Write a protein that binds this ligand. Structure first.
Ligand SMILES: Nc1ncnc2c1ncn2[C@@H]1O[C@H](COP(=O)(O)OP(=O)(O)O)[C@@H](O)[C@H]1O
Length: 247
């Protein structure tokens, strides 16, 4: 469930609904921590493939260089370490939506493999010559200007141009300050609901303290400050004294 309130955020959801209805590749830009994922799910849930699978994979957090292996899947013996066969994330997302989180972290070669998938609408596991028909809607995210990243020669221009049909730039928290208060209360609410506690209120002085912080870590920091405040207030009424930022 996504909560927006700023007129700037409302304009983005207005666009999001328009692409959700289609099968177009959506590219969600913006800084780290602005929740450019909870929007992809929104796009999924607003898409005709809502009832379908929703497969997410973070290309910047897959250890032991298993990004390629987990995306396409592999047969037994495709590489040293492949003791078993394994379906790829594209196969798991059949009839639904796949999210390529932080897509700017794919090596140039993996981007070439991804391109063929997008073009031919088919995938083949590592060590398999047999192609698998794919009916999958593609979403992707990046916290870096892909255009200049293409210009830097670290990203394929053709891949960028296939993913930049309908870009959406989810802005920093300080450029959408009207999102801050509803967002804070939502985070308070999800933690009290996670521990069966009644949700407490937040003081006026606390809100102002929250509004006048630039939030360099954006919503992922807001979540921290709130968790911190809930610890300090012992799940009670949050005052301007339980809110510790970085100043
Ligand atoms: N508009 C929003 N509504 C509700 N939750 C949000 C919103 N924006 C960010 N969040 C929260 O911020 C957290 C981080 O979002 P995430 O999509 O992981 O950011 P990023 O992908 O940019 O690192 C999530 O827990 C998410 O619930």
């Amino acid at each position: 469930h996504m909560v927006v309130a700023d007129t700037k955020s409302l304009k983005l959801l207005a666009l999001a609904d328009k692409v959700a209805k289609t099968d177009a590749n959506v590219m969600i830009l913006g800084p780290s921590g602005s929740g450019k994922e909870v929007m992809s799910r929104y796009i999924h849930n607003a898409s005709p493939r809502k009832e379908g699978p929703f497969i997410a994979i973070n290309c910047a957090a897959i250890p032991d260089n298993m990004l390629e292996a987990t995306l396409f899947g592999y047969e037994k013996g495709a590489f040293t370490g492949a003791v078993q066969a394994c379906p790829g994330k594209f196969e798991q997302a059949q009839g639904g939506t796949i999210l390529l989180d932080e897509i700017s972290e794919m090596d140039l070669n993996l981007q070439a493999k991804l391109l063929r998938v997008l073009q031919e609408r088919e995938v083949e596991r590592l060590g398999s010559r047999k192609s698998i028909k794919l009916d999958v809607r593609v979403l992707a995210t990046s916290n870096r200007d892909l255009k200049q990243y293409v210009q830097a020669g670290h990203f394929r221009e053709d891949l960028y141009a296939r993913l930049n049909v309908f870009p959406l730039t989810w802005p920093a928290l300080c450029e959408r300050k009207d999102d801050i208060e509803p967002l804070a209360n939502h985070l308070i609410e999800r933690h009290c609901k996670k521990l069966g506690l009644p949700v407490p209120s937040i003081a006026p002085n606390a809100i102002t303290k929250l509004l006048n912080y630039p939030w360099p870590g954006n919503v992922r920091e807001l979540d921290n400050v709130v968790q911190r405040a809930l610890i300090l207030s012992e799940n009670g009424h949050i005052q301007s004294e339980h809110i510790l930022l970085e100043g």
